[PDB]
Amino acid sequence: PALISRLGALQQIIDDTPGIRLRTLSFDAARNALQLEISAVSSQALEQFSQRARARFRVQTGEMKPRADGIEGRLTLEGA
Amino acid sequence: EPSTVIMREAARHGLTIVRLQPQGSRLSLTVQPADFQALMAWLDALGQAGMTTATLAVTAVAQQPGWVTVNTLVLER
Amino acid sequence: EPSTVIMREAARHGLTIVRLQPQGSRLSLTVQPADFQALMAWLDALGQAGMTTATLAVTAVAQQPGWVTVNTLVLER
Amino acid sequence: TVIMREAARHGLTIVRLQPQGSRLSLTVQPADFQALMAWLDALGQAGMTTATLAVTAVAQQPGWVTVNTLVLER
Protein backbone atom coordinates (compact mmCIF):
# COMPACT_ATOMS: atom_id res chain seq x y z
CA PRO A 1 0.00 0.00 0.00
CA ALA A 2 2.65 2.55 -1.16
CA LEU A 3 -0.08 5.25 -1.31
CA ILE A 4 -1.77 5.15 2.17
CA SER A 5 1.08 3.68 4.24
CA ARG A 6 3.59 6.44 3.37
CA LEU A 7 1.31 8.98 5.13
CA GLY A 8 2.47 9.46 8.72
CA ALA A 9 6.25 9.54 8.51
CA LEU A 10 5.43 11.84 5.56
CA GLN A 11 3.38 13.90 8.05
CA GLN A 12 6.07 13.71 10.77
CA ILE A 13 9.30 14.56 8.85
CA ILE A 14 7.34 17.53 7.45
CA ASP A 15 6.15 18.63 10.90
CA ASP A 16 9.64 17.91 12.33
CA THR A 17 11.42 20.39 10.03
CA PRO A 18 12.09 23.66 11.95
CA GLY A 19 9.81 26.26 10.29
CA ILE A 20 6.88 24.58 8.53
CA ARG A 21 3.81 22.37 9.23
CA LEU A 22 1.44 20.06 7.29
CA ARG A 23 -1.88 22.00 7.44
CA THR A 24 -4.16 19.89 5.23
CA LEU A 25 -4.14 16.49 3.53
CA SER A 26 -6.51 14.85 1.01
CA PHE A 27 -6.53 11.38 -0.56
CA ASP A 28 -8.97 9.99 -3.17
CA ALA A 29 -8.25 6.38 -4.20
CA ALA A 30 -10.63 6.59 -7.19
CA ARG A 31 -9.02 9.80 -8.60
CA ASN A 32 -5.55 8.64 -7.42
CA ALA A 33 -4.79 12.09 -5.97
CA LEU A 34 -2.90 12.97 -2.76
CA GLN A 35 -3.28 16.77 -2.23
CA LEU A 36 -0.95 18.18 0.44
CA GLU A 37 -0.97 21.66 1.94
CA ILE A 38 2.09 22.77 3.89
CA SER A 39 2.16 26.06 5.80
CA ALA A 40 4.81 28.35 7.26
CA VAL A 41 4.98 29.37 10.94
CA SER A 42 7.92 31.79 10.34
CA SER A 43 9.13 34.01 7.36
CA GLN A 44 11.19 32.31 4.58
CA ALA A 45 11.45 28.69 5.83
CA LEU A 46 9.12 27.28 3.16
CA GLU A 47 11.79 27.59 0.43
CA GLN A 48 14.86 26.77 2.54
CA PHE A 49 13.45 23.62 4.19
CA SER A 50 11.86 22.39 0.95
CA GLN A 51 14.43 21.57 -1.79
CA ARG A 52 15.41 18.69 0.57
CA ALA A 53 11.82 17.28 0.61
CA ARG A 54 11.70 16.33 -3.13
CA ALA A 55 14.47 13.81 -2.42
CA ARG A 56 12.05 12.12 0.11
CA PHE A 57 9.45 11.63 -2.64
CA ARG A 58 10.78 9.27 -5.41
CA VAL A 59 12.30 6.68 -3.04
CA GLN A 60 9.30 4.28 -2.77
CA THR A 61 6.61 4.55 -5.52
CA GLY A 62 5.71 8.24 -5.84
CA GLU A 63 2.99 10.33 -7.47
CA MET A 64 4.30 13.92 -7.94
CA LYS A 65 2.28 16.17 -10.32
CA PRO A 66 2.31 19.98 -9.57
CA ARG A 67 3.64 22.10 -6.62
CA ALA A 68 2.08 25.59 -6.23
CA ASP A 69 3.60 28.15 -3.80
CA GLY A 70 1.69 31.42 -3.28
CA ILE A 71 3.31 32.90 -0.14
CA GLU A 72 0.21 32.89 2.05
CA GLY A 73 2.36 30.76 4.31
CA ARG A 74 1.12 28.38 1.58
CA LEU A 75 2.53 25.43 -0.42
CA THR A 76 0.17 23.10 -2.33
CA LEU A 77 1.55 19.67 -3.33
CA GLU A 78 -0.12 17.00 -5.42
CA GLY A 79 0.99 13.37 -5.35
CA ALA A 80 -1.38 12.09 -8.07
CA GLU B 1 -18.43 -8.32 10.44
CA PRO B 2 -17.29 -4.93 9.03
CA SER B 3 -18.71 -2.37 11.51
CA THR B 4 -17.49 -4.43 14.47
CA VAL B 5 -13.86 -4.71 13.27
CA ILE B 6 -13.79 -0.97 12.47
CA MET B 7 -15.00 -0.05 15.97
CA ARG B 8 -12.82 -2.58 17.87
CA GLU B 9 -9.67 -1.31 16.06
CA ALA B 10 -10.76 2.31 16.59
CA ALA B 11 -10.80 1.69 20.35
CA ARG B 12 -7.41 -0.15 20.13
CA HIS B 13 -5.90 3.08 18.66
CA GLY B 14 -7.50 5.63 21.01
CA LEU B 15 -10.01 6.93 18.46
CA THR B 16 -13.72 7.66 18.80
CA ILE B 17 -16.27 6.95 16.04
CA VAL B 18 -19.39 9.18 16.15
CA ARG B 19 -21.22 8.21 12.89
CA LEU B 20 -21.02 5.03 10.79
CA GLN B 21 -23.37 5.35 7.78
CA PRO B 22 -23.19 3.15 4.63
CA GLN B 23 -23.60 4.34 1.03
CA GLY B 24 -23.23 0.68 -0.03
CA SER B 25 -19.94 -1.33 -0.22
CA ARG B 26 -18.49 1.91 1.34
CA LEU B 27 -18.97 3.38 4.84
CA SER B 28 -18.82 7.12 5.62
CA LEU B 29 -17.25 7.67 9.06
CA THR B 30 -17.29 10.68 11.36
CA VAL B 31 -14.31 10.71 13.74
CA GLN B 32 -13.32 12.92 16.67
CA PRO B 33 -10.09 14.99 16.64
CA ALA B 34 -7.20 12.51 16.54
CA ASP B 35 -3.47 12.07 16.79
CA PHE B 36 -2.60 11.71 13.11
CA GLN B 37 -0.15 8.84 13.71
CA ALA B 38 -2.85 6.87 15.57
CA LEU B 39 -5.32 7.56 12.76
CA MET B 40 -2.90 6.15 10.17
CA ALA B 41 -2.06 3.11 12.34
CA TRP B 42 -5.82 2.52 12.56
CA LEU B 43 -6.46 2.84 8.81
CA ASP B 44 -3.41 0.73 8.07
CA ALA B 45 -4.74 -1.99 10.40
CA LEU B 46 -8.12 -1.88 8.64
CA GLY B 47 -6.26 -2.12 5.29
CA GLN B 48 -4.75 -5.42 6.43
CA ALA B 49 -8.31 -6.62 7.26
CA GLY B 50 -9.64 -5.84 3.74
CA MET B 51 -11.20 -2.38 4.20
CA THR B 52 -9.14 0.17 2.24
CA THR B 53 -9.24 3.95 2.60
CA ALA B 54 -11.28 5.34 -0.32
CA THR B 55 -11.29 8.97 0.81
CA LEU B 56 -9.48 10.86 3.58
CA ALA B 57 -9.47 14.60 4.29
CA VAL B 58 -7.83 15.99 7.41
CA THR B 59 -6.90 19.46 8.69
CA ALA B 60 -4.35 20.17 11.41
CA VAL B 61 -5.53 21.44 14.78
CA ALA B 62 -3.54 24.67 14.85
CA GLN B 63 -2.74 24.71 18.62
CA GLN B 64 -2.04 20.91 18.91
CA PRO B 65 1.16 19.81 17.08
CA GLY B 66 0.35 16.16 16.12
CA TRP B 67 -3.43 16.37 15.84
CA VAL B 68 -5.98 16.72 13.08
CA THR B 69 -9.72 17.04 12.58
CA VAL B 70 -11.10 14.33 10.28
CA ASN B 71 -13.15 16.19 7.68
CA THR B 72 -13.96 13.19 5.47
CA LEU B 73 -13.31 9.45 5.71
CA VAL B 74 -14.79 6.75 3.51
CA LEU B 75 -13.81 3.08 3.66
CA GLU B 76 -14.49 0.47 0.96
CA ARG B 77 -14.18 -3.38 0.92
CA GLU C 1 -31.18 8.69 12.81
CA PRO C 2 -30.95 5.98 15.54
CA SER C 3 -27.37 4.64 15.18
CA THR C 4 -25.93 8.17 14.97
CA VAL C 5 -27.56 9.42 18.19
CA ILE C 6 -26.48 6.25 20.02
CA MET C 7 -22.85 6.66 18.97
CA ARG C 8 -22.62 10.46 19.52
CA GLU C 9 -23.98 10.10 23.08
CA ALA C 10 -21.74 7.07 23.73
CA ALA C 11 -18.68 9.21 22.98
CA ARG C 12 -20.10 12.08 25.13
CA HIS C 13 -20.19 9.67 28.14
CA GLY C 14 -16.84 7.93 27.72
CA LEU C 15 -18.27 4.63 26.46
CA THR C 16 -17.16 2.46 23.56
CA ILE C 17 -19.60 0.58 21.29
CA VAL C 18 -18.25 -2.59 19.64
CA ARG C 19 -21.36 -4.05 17.87
CA LEU C 20 -24.58 -2.40 16.64
CA GLN C 21 -26.80 -5.10 15.07
CA PRO C 22 -30.57 -4.74 14.38
CA GLN C 23 -33.13 -7.52 14.95
CA GLY C 24 -36.26 -5.74 13.73
CA SER C 25 -37.17 -2.24 15.01
CA ARG C 26 -34.73 -2.85 17.97
CA LEU C 27 -30.90 -2.71 18.13
CA SER C 28 -28.68 -5.16 20.04
CA LEU C 29 -25.61 -3.36 21.41
CA THR C 30 -22.31 -4.75 22.63
CA VAL C 31 -20.43 -2.35 24.94
CA GLN C 32 -16.99 -2.42 26.59
CA PRO C 33 -16.67 -2.70 30.41
CA ALA C 34 -17.91 0.64 31.77
CA ASP C 35 -18.31 2.85 34.77
CA PHE C 36 -21.91 2.15 35.79
CA GLN C 37 -22.65 5.83 36.48
CA ALA C 38 -21.54 6.75 32.94
CA LEU C 39 -23.62 3.89 31.50
CA MET C 40 -26.75 5.15 33.27
CA ALA C 41 -26.11 8.77 32.23
CA TRP C 42 -25.81 7.48 28.65
CA LEU C 43 -29.01 5.39 28.69
CA ASP C 44 -30.85 8.23 30.42
CA ALA C 45 -29.70 10.60 27.66
CA LEU C 46 -30.84 8.17 24.96
CA GLY C 47 -34.22 7.95 26.75
CA GLN C 48 -34.62 11.71 26.34
CA ALA C 49 -33.82 11.30 22.60
CA GLY C 50 -36.56 8.67 22.03
CA MET C 51 -34.55 5.42 22.28
CA THR C 52 -35.75 3.48 25.36
CA THR C 53 -33.89 0.66 27.07
CA ALA C 54 -35.84 -2.52 26.23
CA THR C 55 -33.45 -4.96 27.90
CA LEU C 56 -30.46 -4.37 30.18
CA ALA C 57 -28.36 -6.97 32.01
CA VAL C 58 -25.15 -5.95 33.77
CA THR C 59 -22.74 -7.69 36.16
CA ALA C 60 -20.16 -6.05 38.39
CA VAL C 61 -16.53 -6.46 37.46
CA ALA C 62 -14.48 -7.99 40.23
CA GLN C 63 -12.20 -6.52 41.22
CA GLN C 64 -13.08 -3.05 39.84
CA PRO C 65 -15.23 -0.84 42.16
CA GLY C 66 -17.96 0.97 40.18
CA TRP C 67 -17.59 -0.95 36.92
CA VAL C 68 -19.81 -3.43 35.15
CA THR C 69 -19.84 -5.61 32.06
CA VAL C 70 -22.91 -5.03 29.88
CA ASN C 71 -24.14 -8.58 29.28
CA THR C 72 -27.28 -7.65 27.33
CA LEU C 73 -28.54 -4.33 25.99
CA VAL C 74 -31.37 -3.88 23.53
CA LEU C 75 -32.71 -0.46 22.54
CA GLU C 76 -35.99 0.37 20.83
CA ARG C 77 -37.43 3.57 19.25
CA THR D 1 20.49 42.34 -11.78
CA VAL D 2 22.15 38.93 -11.29
CA ILE D 3 19.05 36.82 -12.08
CA MET D 4 20.42 36.04 -15.56
CA ARG D 5 24.06 35.39 -14.47
CA GLU D 6 22.91 32.92 -11.77
CA ALA D 7 20.45 31.31 -14.21
CA ALA D 8 23.34 30.49 -16.55
CA ARG D 9 25.46 29.26 -13.56
CA HIS D 10 22.68 26.68 -12.80
CA GLY D 11 21.90 25.50 -16.35
CA LEU D 12 19.01 26.68 -18.54
CA THR D 13 17.24 29.85 -19.43
CA ILE D 14 15.02 32.84 -18.70
CA VAL D 15 12.84 33.64 -21.73
CA ARG D 16 10.65 36.62 -20.64
CA LEU D 17 11.25 39.20 -17.88
CA GLN D 18 8.43 41.69 -17.17
CA PRO D 19 8.37 43.94 -14.05
CA GLN D 20 5.24 45.05 -12.19
CA GLY D 21 6.97 47.20 -9.54
CA SER D 22 9.62 45.74 -7.17
CA ARG D 23 8.46 42.26 -8.44
CA LEU D 24 9.55 40.50 -11.66
CA SER D 25 7.33 38.02 -13.54
CA LEU D 26 9.50 35.37 -15.23
CA THR D 27 8.95 32.75 -17.89
CA VAL D 28 11.54 29.95 -17.57
CA GLN D 29 12.25 26.88 -19.72
CA PRO D 30 11.61 23.31 -18.47
CA ALA D 31 14.30 22.64 -15.85
CA ASP D 32 15.81 20.09 -13.51
CA PHE D 33 13.92 20.88 -10.29
CA GLN D 34 17.02 20.55 -8.09
CA ALA D 35 18.86 23.08 -10.29
CA LEU D 36 15.85 25.42 -10.18
CA MET D 37 15.83 25.35 -6.37
CA ALA D 38 19.62 25.87 -6.17
CA TRP D 39 19.07 28.89 -8.44
CA LEU D 40 16.20 30.39 -6.40
CA ASP D 41 18.03 29.71 -3.17
CA ALA D 42 21.09 31.55 -4.57
CA LEU D 43 18.87 34.50 -5.54
CA GLY D 44 17.45 34.39 -1.97
CA GLN D 45 20.99 34.95 -0.65
CA ALA D 46 21.71 38.74 -0.62
CA GLY D 47 18.02 39.67 -1.12
CA MET D 48 15.32 38.78 -3.65
CA THR D 49 12.90 36.02 -2.61
CA THR D 50 10.43 33.79 -4.48
CA ALA D 51 6.96 35.37 -4.15
CA THR D 52 5.05 32.87 -6.32
CA LEU D 53 6.03 29.53 -7.90
CA ALA D 54 3.86 27.03 -9.80
CA VAL D 55 5.41 23.97 -11.45
CA THR D 56 4.22 20.77 -13.16
CA ALA D 57 6.35 17.62 -13.46
CA VAL D 58 6.46 17.14 -17.26
CA ALA D 59 5.77 13.47 -18.12
CA GLN D 60 8.76 11.06 -18.51
CA GLN D 61 10.91 13.17 -16.15
CA PRO D 62 13.68 11.86 -13.86
CA GLY D 63 13.50 15.18 -11.93
CA TRP D 64 12.23 17.74 -14.46
CA VAL D 65 9.40 20.30 -14.26
CA THR D 66 7.87 23.06 -16.38
CA VAL D 67 7.67 26.45 -14.65
CA ASN D 68 4.07 27.61 -15.07
CA THR D 69 4.32 30.74 -12.90
CA LEU D 70 7.22 32.51 -11.17
CA VAL D 71 7.30 35.93 -9.53
CA LEU D 72 10.29 37.28 -7.57
CA GLU D 73 10.22 40.19 -5.11
CA ARG D 74 13.05 42.46 -3.80
Nutshell version of this structure?
The complex is a heterotetramer, with 1 copy of chain A (80 residues), 2 copies of chain B (77 residues) and 1 copy of chain D (74 residues). Helices cover 20% and strands 35% of the residues of chain A.
**CATH C-level category of chain B:** Alpha Beta
Largest interface, with counts of residues having CB < 8 Å to the other chain, equals: A-B, 18 and 20 residues
Terminal CA distance of chain D: 11 Å
CATH fold node name of chain B:
Gyrase A, domain 2
The total number of structural domains of chain B is 1
- Please tell me how large the radius of gyration of chain D is: 12 Å
* CATH homology superfamily name of chain B: General secretion pathway protein M, EpsM
Supply the helix-strand structural class of chain D: alpha+beta
The assigned structural class of chain B equals: alpha+beta
Beta-strand content estimate of chain D: 35-45%
Helical fraction of chain B equals: 25-40%
Count the DSSP helices of chain B. Answer: 2
Integer tally of domains of chain D? 1
Q: Which CATH architecture of chain D is right?
A: 2-Layer Sandwich
Label the overall shape of chain D: globular
Approximate shape of chain B:
globular
Characterize the structure shown.
The complex is a heterotetramer, with one copy of chain A (80 residues), two copies of chain B (77 residues) and one copy of chain D (74 residues). With 80 residues, chain A is α+β, with helices and mostly antiparallel strands. Chain A has one domain (1-80). Chain A is 20% helix and 35% strand. Chain A is built from three helices and four strands. The two termini of chain A are 15 Å apart. Chain B is α+β, with helices and mostly antiparallel strands and 77 residues long. Chain B has a single domain, classed as 2-Layer Sandwich (Gyrase A, domain 2). Helix content of chain B is 31%, strand content 43%. Chain B is built from two helices and five strands. In chain B, strands 1, 2, 3, 4 and 5 form a five-stranded antiparallel beta sheet that branches. In chain B, a hairpin with a 3-residue loop joins strand 1 and strand 2. By secondary structure, chain D is an alpha+beta fold. Chain D has one domain: Gyrase A, domain 2 (2-Layer Sandwich), CATH 3.30.1360.100. Chain D has helices at 3-9, 33-44; strands at 14-19, 23-28, 31-32, 49-56, 64-73. The interface between A and D is medium-sized, with 15 and 19 residues.
